[PDB]
Write a protein that binds this ligand. Structure first.
Ligand SMILES: CC(C)(O)C(=O)SCCNC(=O)CCNC(=O)[C@H](O)C(C)(C)COP(=O)(O)OP(=O)(O)OC[C@H]1O[C@@H](n2cnc3c(N)ncnc32)[C@H](O)[C@@H]1OP(=O)(O)O
Ligand SMILES: CC(C)(O)C(=O)SCCNC(=O)CCNC(=O)[C@H](O)C(C)(C)COP(=O)(O)OP(=O)(O)OC[C@H]1O[C@@H](n2cnc3c(N)ncnc32)[C@H](O)[C@@H]1OP(=O)(O)O
Ligand SMILES: CC(C)(O)C(=O)SCCNC(=O)CCNC(=O)[C@H](O)C(C)(C)COP(=O)(O)OP(=O)(O)OC[C@H]1O[C@@H](n2cnc3c(N)ncnc32)[C@H](O)[C@@H]1OP(=O)(O)O
Ligand SMILES: Cc1ncc(Cc2csc(CCOP(=O)(O)OP(=O)(O)O)c2C)c(N)n1
Ligand SMILES: Cc1ncc(Cc2csc(CCOP(=O)(O)OP(=O)(O)O)c2C)c(N)n1
Ligand SMILES: Cc1ncc(Cc2csc(CCOP(=O)(O)OP(=O)(O)O)c2C)c(N)n1
Ligand SMILES: [Mg+2]
Ligand SMILES: [Mg+2]
Ligand SMILES: [Mg+2]
Ligand SMILES: [Mg+2]
Lengths: 572, 574, 572
């Protein structure tokens, strides 16, 4: 080892920890790190807005399991990340944000961009620190890295900033410890056999077991989950954060029976999933017959809103496998699951076939479902949807996408946070992670306006993305709440913008579609010429399931009117 | 004769009664009940493409008009999209109100849609950040927050209020709806003490080289009491980016091209509503080696930072300036230093401005950005009146060129002490809607513009007559230059030759590209006749601004700029 | 100037700013400052509990107007101050707390006492900062000093901590600026004449004007207040934080007519006073006929709960004088004030005479009012109450003290915060500030147990205090709420402790009293042998006004039941 500046050690720490790319936007306060990353051969993915760099890192970690890294300058560079940090905090995604900050001698003196970055980010990070001791920077990086994984907290984003005088300070070789530089494996806490047995007993006693998966299950490959589904006879639901773990044809997979499963299950088993608003707070009002069991590698998916009759805090794969083993010699009663599955095959197949011929709305414009129809039609022709990373974003468009996107290798969207504008930055992170196939992002026009200029980033970095915009000239799920519940539509209209022209202005391939019969060709040409955008002139006359269920109205107790009605009855 | 009405109605009424005739924002369900009531009262709703831009619009509105402005945004990402623009308003000490959505009280901490700790995130960069849980007290909490935005119990700047949707829908009995909370209130007017006035006038009589440097608080005045004091004192005058336009260009004190000379030699620095932050070298003795210090302001945020006054006046600055002018009634100032600076300033500024019309292309064959400022100067008195124009600047090298190139504006806005890239378009929109009779002109770097470009759509939908001129140098170019000069490696600072005119046309604005500098005057003339409009100017990468040359990109240990930093290193080793 | 360590410059800053004493408790982290203060001849008043040192500083500043200083070590030394800091924050008293903290190299590494002091104190200070730049320490001290006065905030406590490696670092003489070392005068913002005139017009139109004073009025000597009372014909009330500004015999002084003044005034004028719970939130329910005017040098006494038809933000003395001037040629209608005053003379004189002969309670023990009787009886004999600093603390005892303490030069008590245990630390600060006369502190036994060991501090530092304890073997106002509103008395009894013996064990003079006829002699002997304690065996059968009005019960809208009943009527 030689005496080297902090900036060099930070670059080395990152590379040794497996970082081969940093998302970011250059400023002088971080230039010393930026320089060293480039001299080490770390790819720098420079963006148009720092928020998008954090979104890119989120997508990288969520897909790959490798903690990703954004780097931004002092002041507005850091404050531009707060939305993307909050989003990663809510979704419990490990990532590191490296911020610039002013030199120590000028503290509190009004130097350029001295705002309290750590104070702003502390409520939505696992750690937010200013590193004032050159000798201890390496250690602070390694500990923050562990905390992003969930050590001393739960998985999520961490923030570190180094005053520029500290960045430029030398660290003697004695203080450069191999144990802080080196990559570390994930923790693997194991289940206790008594908890495994107690869950197996609940499954044997249950007539209508159901498993709902989430983030922690999606860290596994799905094979132990399928083993437990096979041993238990349970129905299976996933969530936006856990798509793709169970084959569609599996006798447990009943994705179009969500209400039926929640209403009747006598044993809900959560697997790395929160019982947040997305699952009716786990309320007895939404699960009126369910006993509860909770399995996760973090108590963030064990203690919220409902407690387990058993709770297992362990690596989910090992827990699922141990319970499957313990159900040796059990013959599950699958008659409820099978009855749901028969109804699911009809409902899901009818729905998917209908996507190819959905009528135009009263305004003469394309129903957004035709986008999902056209993608389904191209599957096995010009793209393999089962190898494709699908992204969804927007309001009505996002809700239609939850039903319209059924074959994807992986799925990302606006998350529990409802973070509009993720579609383009997610698509870019996904595409650079998996360069062999186009990534397809389907987005509302409202959402797309937030991060549209990242089309520039996609072209400059050659990220093979296809963005498809539902251009309905509106924040349409909002326009509909205003009409239905208030009788006045105001400040929710947008214009008939040329998003293909926006894409072409930033060097991407672009095409506008007004005729639904043109969608397959337009998407074919977009796939062949990625990065590409398809601007689809869509109807305002089309209520998504979210629209119809009051999501826009914000009831007192639950996100949706039907669940809220059930909760009001439970209360009395 | 009051009746029982929901909180959402009272909030809309509170705002209209406090003089709010417009609200910038982006609709979500959590704020819809307020949004609805604002529209039924006839308050204009200016709906944007990104909530950060709504807060920048409110900032511009307040900074120009002095009327506290309002942004309204939904829970979760709607609130977190504001943080940059809130920080910017906090650093610049601009009163504004952000009204955020938030989940109903029953669902607190349960993982409802968008339950993040908005108030904890915003508390470090607001004067007040609160969740309002008592229907009966919402009016009161609004009135108090409004007063704290003005600087009561703190200093001027942004405040944040959020009302859980169940509270928004709750009725308030009429007896709890107090006129005193609904009604508009006047600004405070603390007055100077005559002993402090006398003491300042004594310092001015004893000084040979008095200099006044203005800031935010001065810019809240019309400039006429400032001119009275300049006249009575014989002081030299500098402004800052936040105080342009208070003193006529031809005034014998106005020596804007003599910044280093004034700071090096003044024996009496008088700050008027101005911080001695990095923009004035921390007020360091290293940068003001001969100055005694006097500070005048209506807030100690412009009295106590880095240097203390031999006298500090905490008062409405207009009254303080007038009182000191009166106290100098029989003083005959020695103006010979000011006069010698002014004579040299006249020539240096005139030569500089003339040379803007003919600046040569850089080695890459592209337009020098100074030609944009030349073209605007040439059109003055032809198709636009720069003295009635609101000018905005944003970017890196472009912004530094703009500080020399923009000399005749009625009002000036830019990226601020925060160095907040992307303000150009949202500022221009707020400015144009405040002052609808003439185009607003925003000159921006391509880097900065990419942050808020989609707000061109907002300008077209709301008919904001803006002209945006882009220095398209295919780069974050002040950064590219720091990389080359101090590190020998240029990486992740290049952008592309994007069609910003095409982006503007895609959103229904007028757009044209300029590659030939002789085409600039026409392109800007056509842009002014067809606003909202963008002019995409292919500019050179071979052009170092004064900020570029002075190390701004490098971030020295003690001062923002190398020359000032060198002076501070010398001061330390005495 | 020479190159000197930060610790020396801090000692010099304090002495130059007028600090001639520092209250505190030594630890290694602050020893370098402690050492330099002692070498400069600054008196070190070392205490038994760091909280008491902050209370002492509070009393010094509140009495003298000079900002006072406590100094405490890292970790538990700082955390022991939080109550006394909160108390000073609520009362808006300028003070500086200097905390120790660990050296910079060991940050976040679990060094001895690395807890987040600044994060803990930030919600209840005007400034809380860690000073990491030796060169800028002087400047940070001067700015924090200004912020304690109210600059950029409102008057109250500030916290500064210097890592011990920074304390030991030299500062070059060039960076030691006279302007940061030197003492600074208080600000004096002046009224605008239009606001003065508008207030004078409201006074001319009012039939029943009333002035209520507070903290900001008590920063003046009272003479401009009396000028305005004379020019306006207003009734006058003070509050616990504004006693002693208006002579008792003044025709406006109607201290026993509090409810009558609030009920009928048609013009309430606050003078440096909050309309907090102590004045019924300024509610129309408590002031049903009042227009409102607010005068103060801080908007902390202008904007809370009621807005002024006029609000003057100025030095209160100048504002009061300007309004008195503007009432040149006004003949005030004093008939309401005079009618209140005639009733006041009878009520107050009857009450004060009755203090000399209050009966023992049913349990055979002294009524606490006899303490106030005995003090009244000694006035003009062995002490001059009009030159005496009186302190009150406790529950029932505190409430009886508000009526029983009527002649004092100055009065301190538990404050709006209701901070039990202030009595002894306040008495010590007061006594060292004004060494020529004994200070008398009257306290409940509950309150006294919190800070009793500071009797040791009083003896070691020769603070001439007399503490008189109402020893009723109870948190008695709490015992009474439990009996009246819950029917069960539990965990509110104390024991028949020997507080005279406690005092004698720490080297003070002590005496126990069981016979009310012994009180005058015991208090005479205590005054002659200060520091001294008188342990008065008092009754549990004695409801104070606070007890009778529900203070213990915490109603929904107001601190007291009658005010709360009025608010409930106003709401409907
Ligand atoms: C408040 C506001 C407007 O300002 C916002 O900020 S909103 C933020 C933007 N939007 C969001 O982030 C979305 C938030 N909401 C949601 O995530 C969802 O409403 C929910 C998770 C809370 C509830 O979703 P569901 O459990 O209903 O899941 P979906 O996948 O949406 O399924 C809807 C229905 O289609 C069914 N379905 C699913 N896949 C299908 C398929 N393939 N074929 C046919 N039907 C299918 C499904 O069973 C179900 O019908 P049913 O069983 O209730 O009768
Ligand atoms: C760190 C990083 C890069 O990552 C960032 O985030 S930077 C953020 C974006 N940039 C900014 O926000 C800029 C921040 N810096 C500044 O604001 C300024 O550098 C400063 C306030 C610190 C210094 O500005 P000056 O006091 O030098 O003022 P300017 O108006 O720029 O004047 C520069 C020179 O032009 C002169 N000048 C002004 N008007 C003139 C005129 N009309 N004609 C000729 N010369 C003129 C002026 O006198 C002076 O020359 P001199 O006296 O020093 O020799
Ligand atoms: C909640 C709990 C129990 O856990 C706690 O923590 S309590 C904390 C400990 N206690 C406190 O900090 C006290 C808090 N409360 C108070 O400060 C008071 O209740 C109050 C400020 C809110 C209200 O006080 P008042 O305005 O009633 O003032 P007092 O000086 O107490 O006067 C009481 C009465 O005696 C009268 N009075 C005053 N001086 C007199 C005199 N000299 N002679 C005769 N009567 C006199 C006075 O007029 C009034 O009677 P009326 O007009 O209402 O009929
Ligand atoms: C940053 C932010 N601001 C506001 C909102 C609130 C919202 C949730 S859904 C929606 C409408 C989205 O319109 P889009 O055109 O994308 O989709 P569509 O319904 O098909 O027309 C809004 C405004 C959220 N969640 N995030
Ligand atoms: C949100 C944010 N992120 C980064 C930065 C740091 C910066 C300051 S100046 C600059 C270059 C701006 O490039 P532009 O193209 O607008 O101008 P020009 O130099 O003429 O090419 C950067 C990146 C700031 N202040 N704010
Ligand atoms: C630190 C703290 N803990 C509890 C309380 C709550 C309280 C307010 S009054 C009171 C009883 C005081 O008993 P004392 O014996 O002093 O007075 P007396 O009624 O005459 O017997 C308590 C416990 C407060 N305010 N502060
Ligand atoms: Mg839309
Ligand atoms: Mg943003
Ligand atoms: Mg550029
Ligand atoms: Mg007691």
């Amino acid at each position: 080892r030689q005496s080297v500046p902090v900036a060099s050690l930070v670059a080395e720490f990152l590379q040794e920890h497996g970082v081969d790319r940093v998302f970011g936007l250059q400023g002088g306060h971080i230039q010393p790190i930026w320089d060293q990353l480039a001299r080490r051969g770390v790819r720098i993915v420079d963006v148009r807005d720092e928020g998008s760099a954090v979104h890119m890192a989120h997508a990288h970690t969520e897909l790959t399991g490798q903690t990703a890294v954004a780097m931004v300058t002092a002041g507005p560079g850091v404050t531009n990340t707060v939305t993307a940090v909050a989003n990663a905090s809510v979704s419990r995604i490990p990532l590191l944000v490296i911020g610039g900050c002013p030199p120590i001698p000028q503290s509190n003196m009004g130097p350029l961009q001295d705002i309290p970055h750590t104070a702003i980010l502390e409520p939505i990070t696992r750690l937010a620190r200013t590193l004032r001791s050159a000798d201890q920077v390496l250690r602070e990086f390694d500990e923050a890295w562990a905390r992003a994984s969930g050590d001393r907290g739960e998985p999520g984003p961490v923030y570190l900033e180094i005053p520029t005088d500290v960045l430029r300070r030398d660290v003697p070789p004695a203080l450069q410890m191999r144990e802080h530089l080196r990559a570390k494996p994930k923790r693997r806490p194991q289940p206790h056999p008594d908890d495994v047995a107690a869950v197996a007993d609940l499954i044997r006693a249950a007539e209508k077991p159901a498993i709902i998966s989430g983030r922690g299950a999606r860290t596994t490959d799905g094979t132990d989950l399928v083993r437990l589904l096979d041993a238990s006879g349970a129905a299976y639901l996933d969530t936006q954060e856990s798509r793709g773990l169970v084959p569609d044809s599996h006798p447990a997979a009943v994705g179009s029976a969500r209400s039926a499963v929640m209403r009747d299950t006598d044993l809900l088993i959560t697997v790395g999933r929160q019982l947040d608003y997305q699952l009716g707070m786990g309320s007895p009002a939404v699960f009126p017959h369910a006993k509860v069991v909770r399995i996760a590698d973090t108590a963030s998916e064990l203690i919220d809103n409902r407690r387990g009759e058993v709770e297992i805090l362990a690596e989910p794969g090992a827990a699922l496998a141990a319970i499957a083993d313990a159900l040796k010699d059990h013959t599950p009663d699958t008659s409820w699951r099978d009855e749901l599955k028969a109804k699911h095959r009809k409902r899901a197949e009818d729905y998917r076939q209908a996507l190819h011929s959905t009528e135009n709305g009263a305004d003469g414009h394309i129903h957004p479902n035709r986008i999902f129809g056209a993608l389904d039609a191209l599957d096995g022709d010009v793209l393999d949807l089962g190898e494709t990373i699908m992204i969804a974003d927007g309001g009505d468009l996002l809700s239609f996408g939850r039903l319209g996107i059924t074959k994807a290798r992986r799925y990302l969207d606006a998350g529990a946070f409802g973070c509009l504008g993720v579609a383009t930055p997610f698509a870019i992170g996904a595409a650079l992670a998996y360069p062999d196939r186009p990534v397809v992002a389907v987005t509302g026009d409202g959402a797309f306006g937030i991060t549209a200029t990242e089309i520039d980033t996609a072209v400059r970095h050659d990220a093979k993305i296809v963005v498809i915009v539902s251009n309905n000239r509106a924040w349409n799920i909002e326009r509909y709440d205003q009409a239905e519940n208030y009788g006045l539509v105001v400040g929710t209209d947008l214009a008939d913008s040329d998003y293909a022209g926006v894409a072409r202005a930033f060097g991407a391939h672009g095409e506008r579609v007004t005729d639904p019969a043109e969608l397959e060709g337009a998407i074919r040409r977009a796939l062949a010429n990625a990065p590409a955008l398809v601007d689809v002139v869509t109807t305002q006359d089309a209520a998504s399931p979210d629209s119809g269920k009051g999501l826009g109205f914000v009831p007192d107790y639950q996100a949706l009117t039907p669940w809220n009605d059930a909760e009001v009855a439970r209360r009395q």
